[PDB]
C-alpha cells in the first residue's frame, strides 16, 4: 500500500503541479486543433491565408514550451523531496521490524531497497509521472476539443480511447505473465545444476561423480516439454497492441473518407482530420514505449513496498517508574516458535531468577538456548506467555525505555564501520574517558589497543582490519560493560586457541562494581564454575535447575556434561 509518499502536508505544491501539468496537456492538445484550420487552408484555392493560423500555432507552441519547462523544474524539485523523505522513512523504520522477518532473502530485499533506489526515484518523479499521465490524458482532451468541429468523428475517438487503453494494458499483462512463467521454468531447470555444483566435493571424494553427472544430464535431456504454452502465451504481448493500433488507424481513416465522400465535409477538411487522427494515435504508442521502464520501476519500488509493509512489534504504553535497581527475571508458561520455519521451540519453560546472582545456562547445541537470552533481553516476543522482569511484564514498556534494562554480549560480534574507540563508545555516548579506560582495562583488551598501529583509533569495521575472532569479541565485551543497565546477558562466543577471551569473560563475571543480575550461557568449565544457580536446558525445557555442588553429586546429565568437559580437554591424537 504505502509505496511512495510525498510529505503529504503541503497540499499547495502538489495541487499546483497537478494543474500545471494539466495546463501543459491542454496546450499540447490545442496544438492539433490549431493544426486543423492551417491544413484546411493549405489545400484550398487560397493557401496564402494560412499565415494567421501559423502564427496562432506558434503562440500555442511557445506557451507549451514555457509550461512544460516549469513543469519539469517542479518535477525535479519534487523528486529530490521524495527521495529524501522516503529514504529517511525506510532507514527510520528498521529498528522496529519484527526480528524473525529477516530471512535469507528478506534481508537481501531490504539491502537492495536501501542501497539501490536513489536514481530510480529521482527519475521516477519526472520521467515516469509526467509522460505517462500526460500521454494518457492527451487523447481524451483531443477528442473533447474535436467534438465541436465534427461530432460524428469526435465521439469515435472517445469510444476509441478505452478500447486502446485496455488493449495496451492487456498486452502488458500478457508480456509480464509470459516472462514470469519463462524465468520460473528456467529456475526449475537450472536448480539441479546448482545442487550438483554445491556438493561437488563429497561426490568427487566418494567416487560418485560420473553417475550423478549422467543422471542430471539425462533429466535435462528428458524433460524438454517446452514451447506450446510458453511460445503461445509469449506471442500476443506485442501483436495485441500492434494490431489494435493499426486497426484503429484504419477505422478512423475509413470514417473520414466515408464522410468526405458522402458530401458532409469538403476535401480539404478531411485531410486535416486525417492528420489529427495520427496526432491522436501517437500518444498511445508513446505510452507503449514506456512498458520496460515502468516494469523496472515497479520492481524497484516493490522492494520498498515489501520493506515498509513488513510486520512491526510494538510494546508502548509507558512504564519503568524508577529503574528497579536490581531486577529479578522470571517468566512462566512461555512458548515462542519462530514465525517462518515453524516448530514449537522453547515450549512452556518457567524459572524465577534472583537479583544480582549469576545464572549459567548450559545445554546441548541447537536446543533453543540463545532464544532464551533474546526473550530475556526483550529482543523477541513470546507467543503464549509473559516475561516478568521485576514483577512487571516487558511488553508493557515504551520501546525507548525497554532497551535500557539489558546489555547483551551477542554470540556473533558486530563492529560497524568506524573506529574501535567509537565502537566502545556506542553504549553510552555521553560517557567520560575514565569509565572508558576502566572498561577497556577490565575487558582484557588494553594489550590489543596497544598491539596495533597509531593507538586506539583504528579503522575496524570490516575487511579484516587486523581484528580476528576473539579480538573483536573482546571489543564487544568492553562495549556491553559500558552501558549501565541492571542485567548482563553474555552468550559465549567461540574463541578457541585464545585464552584472553575466556579470561576477560571470567573477569567480567567476578570483578565488577555494578553488582548486576547476570545470565551467562557457556560451556567451558572455567566460565561455568563462577555461577551459583545453573540451568540445564534440553530441547526447550529446563531439566536440572539446581546448583553446581548439588547437581554434581546427586543427579544426571550434568555429571555427564561435567565428565565430558573434563575429559574432552585432554584428547590428543595418539599415533596408533
Amino acid at each position: 500500500t504505502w509505496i511512495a509518499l510525498v510529505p503529504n502536508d503541503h497540499r499547495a505544491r502538489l495541487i499546483g503541479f497537478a494543474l500545471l501539468a494539466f495546463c501543459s496537456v491542454v496546450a499540447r492538445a490545442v496544438g492539433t486543433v490549431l493544426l486543423v484550420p492551417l491544413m484546411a487552408a493549405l489545400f484550398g484555392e487560397a493557401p496564402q491565408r494560412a499565415w494567421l493560423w501559423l502564427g496562432w500555432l506558434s503562440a500555442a507552441t511557445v506557451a507549451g514550451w514555457v509550461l512544460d519547462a516549469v513543469t519539469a523544474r517542479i518535477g525535479i524539485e519534487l523528486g529530490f523531496a521524495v527521495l529524501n523523505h522516503t529514504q529517511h522513512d525506510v532507514a527510520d523504520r528498521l529498528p522496529v521490524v519484527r526480528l524473525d522477518w529477516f530471512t535469507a532473502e528478506n534481508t537481501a530485499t531490504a539491502r537492495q531497497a536501501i542501497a539501490a533506489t536513489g536514481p530510480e526515484l529521482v527519475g521516477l518523479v519526472v520521467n515516469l509521472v509526467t509522460p505517462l499521465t500526460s500521454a494518457i490524458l492527451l487523447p481524451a482532451v483531443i477528442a473533447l476539443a474535436l467534438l465541436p468541429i465534427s461530432w460524428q468523428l469526435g465521439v469515435a475517438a472517445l469510444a476509441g480511447v478505452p478500447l486502446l487503453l485496455g488493449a495496451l494494458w492487456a498486452s502488458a499483462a500478457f508480456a509480464r505473465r509470459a516472462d514470469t512463467a519463462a524465468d520460473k521454468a528456467n529456475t526449475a531447470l537450472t536448480e539441479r545444476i546448482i545442487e550438483f555444483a554445491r556438493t561437488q566435493q563429497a561426490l568427487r571424494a566418494a567416487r560418485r561423480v560420473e553417475p550423478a553427472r549422467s543422471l542430471v544430464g539425462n533429466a535435462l535431456a528428458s524433460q524438454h516439454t517446452a514451447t506450446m504454452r510458453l511460445l503461445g502465451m509469449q506471442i500476443p504481448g506485442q501483436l495485441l497492441f500492434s494490431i489494435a493500433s493499426q486497426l484503429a488507424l484504419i477505422v478512423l481513416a475509413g470514417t473520414t473518407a466515408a464522410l468526405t465522400i458522402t458530401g458532409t465535409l469538403t476535401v480539404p477538411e478531411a485531410i486535416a482530420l486525417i492528420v489529427v487522427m495520427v496526432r491522436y494515435l501517437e500518444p498511445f504508442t508513446a505510452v507503449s514505449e514506456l512498458a520496460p521502464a515502468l516494469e523496472s520501476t515497479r520492481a524497484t519500488l516493490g522492494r520498498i513496498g515489501s520493506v515498509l509493509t513488513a510486520p512491526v512489534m510494538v510494546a508502548g504504553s509507558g512504564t519503568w517508574r524508577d529503574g528497579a535497581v536490581v531486577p529479578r527475571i522470571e517468566f512462566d508458561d512461555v512458548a515462542f516458535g519462530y514465525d517462518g520455519g515453524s516448530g514449537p521451540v522453547l515450549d512452556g519453560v518457567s524459572f524465577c531468577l534472583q537479583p544480582g546472582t549469576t545464572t549459567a545456562i548450559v545445554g546441548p547445541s541447537g536446543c533453543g538456548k540463545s532464544t532464551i537470552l533474546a526473550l530475556i533481553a526483550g529482543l523477541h516476543q513470546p507467543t503464549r506467555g509473559r516475561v516478568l522482569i521485576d514483577g512487571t511484564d516487558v511488553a508493557t514498556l515504551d520501546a525507548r525505555a525497554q532497551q535500557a534494562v539489558c546489555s547483551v554480549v551477542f554470540q556473533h560480534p558486530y563492529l560497524f564501520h568506524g573506529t574501535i574507540r567509537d565502537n566502545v563508545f556506542a553504549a553510552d555516548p555521553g560517557a567520560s574517558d575514565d569509565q572508558f579506560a576502566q572498561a577497556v582495562r577490565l575487558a582484557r583488551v588494553d594489550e590489543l589497543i596497544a598491539r596495533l598501529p597509531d593507538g586506539a583509533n583504528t579503522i575496524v569495521g570490516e575487511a579484516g582490519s587486523a581484528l580476528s575472532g576473539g579480538e573483536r569479541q573482546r571489543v564487544s565485551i568492553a562495549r556491553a560493560l559500558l552501558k549501565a543497565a541492571p542485567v548482563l546477558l553474555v552468550d559465549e562466543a567461540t574463541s578457541a586457541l585464545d585464552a584472553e577471551n575466556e579470561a576477560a569473560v571470567v573477569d567480567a563475571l567476578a570483578a565488577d562494581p555494578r553488582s548486576r543480575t547476570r545470565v551467562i550461557v557457556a560451556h567451558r568449565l572455567a566460565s561455568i564454575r563462577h555461577a551459583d544457580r545453573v540451568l540445564f536446558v534440553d530441547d526447550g525445557r529446563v531439566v536440572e535447575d539446581g546448583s553446581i555442588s548439588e547437581l554434581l553429586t546427586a543427579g544426571g546429565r550434568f555429571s555427564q556434561f561435567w565428565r565430558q568437559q573434563h575429559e574432552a580437554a585432554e584428547w590428543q591424537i595418539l599415533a596408533e
Partner: protein, 571 residues
Amino acid sequence: SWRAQAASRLLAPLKLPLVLSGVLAALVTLAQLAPFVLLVELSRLLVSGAGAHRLFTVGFAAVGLLGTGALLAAALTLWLHVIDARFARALRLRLLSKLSRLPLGWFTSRGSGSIKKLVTDDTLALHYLVTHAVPDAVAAVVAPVGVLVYLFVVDWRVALVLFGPVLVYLTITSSLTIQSGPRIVQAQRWAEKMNGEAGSYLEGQPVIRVFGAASSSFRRRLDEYIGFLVAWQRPLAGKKTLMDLATRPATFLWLIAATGTLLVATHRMDPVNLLPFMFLGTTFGARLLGIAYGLGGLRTGLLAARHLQVTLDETELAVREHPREPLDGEAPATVVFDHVTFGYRPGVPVIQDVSLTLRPGTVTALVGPSGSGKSTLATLLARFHDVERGAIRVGGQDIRSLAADELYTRVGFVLQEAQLVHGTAAENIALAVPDAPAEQVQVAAREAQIHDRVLRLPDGYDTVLGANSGLSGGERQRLTIARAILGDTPVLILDEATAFADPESEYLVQQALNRLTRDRTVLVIAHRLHTITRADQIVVLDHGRIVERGTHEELLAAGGRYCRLWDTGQG
C-alpha cells in the same frame, strides 16, 4: 572488443539464425511503418476524384499489410524462441560437463553465491538477450533509417530544416557528458560503498536494537549520500530540461508547419507532398532516443556471455600424465613430498620446497601462525591444485598420474564443510560404498556417535535431508565422519578445526575421530598444538617453507619457535 574474439564470442554457433532474425525484424518494422505510406497514397487519391473503388483498394491493401505484419511478427517470435531454447539446452549441457571437471580448489575459491549467480543469472540474462534485445535493437535501428530515407526521397528540404533540433540536442548532450566526468564515477563509488553500509546495517540489527546509539554512523552515511545526490543532480537541471525540450513532437510540429507554409505559399511544394512529414515526422526525435536505448540495452547480455565464456574456457586438471611406474620406496601408504612450490597467483608463491615424507601408520601434524600456508599443503595433497615444481606421490606414484577414481580411492580426507548431499540419511552415510547391506551403515553410525540422533530423527534411516533437516554442525560433521569411516581409505587428512567447531558437541566428535583414525597416515592441521604431543613427527612451517621437523620432546629440547609456541600459555 571485436569479432572472432573467443572469450566473448561463444554465441558464434547461432550467428546465422541471428542474422536471419535480424532480417525478419527489419521486415516486420517496415511492415509496421508502411501504413503511413498507404495513408499518404489514400490522401493523394481522395484529393482528386478517386471513386469508391479506388479507396476500397487502399483499404484492402491496408488489411493485407496488417495481416502480413502480424504473421511475420508471430513467425519471428516462434523462430527466435525455438533457436534460443535449443542453444540454451546445449549451453546447459556444456556447462555441466565442464563443471564436472574443474579442480576442487576452484569451488572453495568462488563459494556458493557466485556459483548460483553465474549459472542461473547468466543463463537467464543470455536467454533474455537472444529473445528480446537483438530483435528490439534491430527494430530500433532500422526504423529511423527507413523514416529518414523516405523523408529525403519525398522532399530533401524539410528534412534538412528538421535536423535542427537533433543538432542542438547533440550539442547540449555533448556539453553535459563532458561536464559530468568526475561526478559519474564519484556516484558509482558512492553506490558501491553504500551497498556495504546497507549490508552492515542489516547485519548488525540486534546490536542496533540493544545499543540504540550505534545507528548514528549509518544514518550519517545515508545523509551524506542523499546530500551528494542532490548536490550532483540539482545544478544540471536547466540544461537537462532545455535539452529535453528539443525532442517534444510540438517542436518538430512547429518546424514542419512553418517550413511547409513557407514553401506552399510560394508555390514550390505541391502541398499533397507534405503529408509524409506531418505523419511520420514528429516522432523522429524519439526515434534516435530509442536507437540509443536499445544499443545500450544490448550490453548486460554481452557482458554476461563474456563472463560465462571466460568461466567455460577454464584450465581443468592435467590428470593422467604418463604413469610414473611406482618406485621402490614403499607402496602401502608411504606418502612422500618433494621440492614443492605452489602459488594461487602466478606471482607470489605460498609454498616453497617442503619435501617431508610420511610413513605408513604415522601421525604427522602441521603447526604455524594462522595464515602461513598451513592448510594449503594438505589441500594440495588431495589434488585441489597442481603443483608448479616438484612432485607429490602416494606410494611412490605421482598423484598427477592417477585417475580421479584411483586417487580418491586411497586419499580420503575430512576437511571442513560437511557438505551433506540431500537424500536418504542411510544412503548419505553409505555414499562411499554404493550398497552396504543395511548393517554396515548402522554399525558405522553407532561407532561414529550419530546412531542415536539419526534414530531420534522423525523417521529414521530413510529421512530425506534438507535445509530444515534440524541437524546441527556437530551432527552433520559426525555424519560425514561416519561416511569417511565407511569409506576406509588408508590415507587421511584432518582439519583439527572440525573438532572444536560445535563447542558443545565436541566429546562425541572426538570419539568419532579417535575411531576414524585407528589405522591411517593421518595428516593433522593442528590449530591448538596441545592435541599433538604423542604425534610421531611434528612439522612447523611459517611463511611457506619448512623450518624444522621432529618429535615433540626433541623439538622442545632444541629451542626454536616451538618452545616459543609451547610456552605461550601452555608452558
